[PDB]
Design a protein around this ligand. Structure first.
Ligand code: TGW
Ligand code: ZN
Length: 208
């Protein structure tokens, strides 16, 4: 029951989502190995993901968390890149979409840096790159990211360089403690704590 609604580039909503995408690009410690080499994106399309049952599943869980955390859901808008994005927008997030080998355990990971999520579009470590050219830095092929509404509740803070949340917490926050320019990454352990709100289609752009 998912429908996708295209946003106009003239729409303030398109513009605010594009700005969050573009402004959160950073350099990565792999020199571009996983995600490719780029400083900005060519945004091709931004679509709103509308699914009433998935939305109600999200808001139900959001209310439970909020009531466990002094009426504070601690909701964020975060990026998610995955080879499962077409399944996620139709079926919702669930344990099949978790990263079993993640550093905070088997969970569903999200990023503040759009370029961090871009590293995972073609799989863990960028897999083998795009299916057409086998190129992790492909400038031709269209990529997709999700910009998701995420309930963190009481988040366990890890200072750093499906499983359960730590007891007494609803998520984990990975705070960068070496790279002064990296933004945070977050993990949830219940698929109901995220809603895939926007589907963003783009290309990475070759630096000039
Ligand atoms: C694991 N990965 C991430 N890790 C840190 C920050 C953000 C992300 C993200 O955007 N995607 C996840 C992810 C990628 C691929 C697969 Cl198969 C599962 C996940 Cl959870
Ligand atoms: Zn390609």
């Amino acid at each position: 029951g998912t429908i996708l609604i295209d946003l106009s580039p003239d729409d303030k909503e398109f513009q605010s989502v594009e700005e969050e995408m573009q402004s959160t690009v950073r350099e990565h410690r792999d020199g571009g190995h996983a995600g490719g080499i780029f400083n900005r994106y060519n945004i091709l399309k931004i679509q709103k993901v509308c699914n009433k049952k998935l939305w109600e599943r999200y808001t139900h869980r959001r209310k439970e968390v909020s009531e466990e955390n002094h009426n504070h859901a601690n909701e964020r808008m975060l990026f998610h890149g995955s080879p499962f994005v077409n399944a996620i927008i139709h079926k919702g997030f669930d344990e099949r979409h978790a990263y079993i080998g993640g550093m905070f355990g088997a969970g569903i990971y999200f990023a503040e840096n759009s370029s961090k999520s871009n590293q995972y579009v073609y799989g863990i470590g960028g897999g083998t790159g795009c299916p057409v050219h086998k190129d992790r830095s492909c400038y031709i092929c269209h990529r997709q990211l999700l910009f998701c509404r995420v309930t963190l509740g009481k988040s366990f803070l890890q200072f750093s360089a499906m499983a359960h949340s730590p007891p007494g917490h609803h998520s984990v926050t990975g705070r960068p403690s070496v790279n002064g320019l990296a933004l945070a990454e977050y993990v949830i352990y219940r698929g109901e704590q995220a809603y895939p709100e926007y589907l963003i289609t783009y290309q990475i752009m070759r630096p000039e």
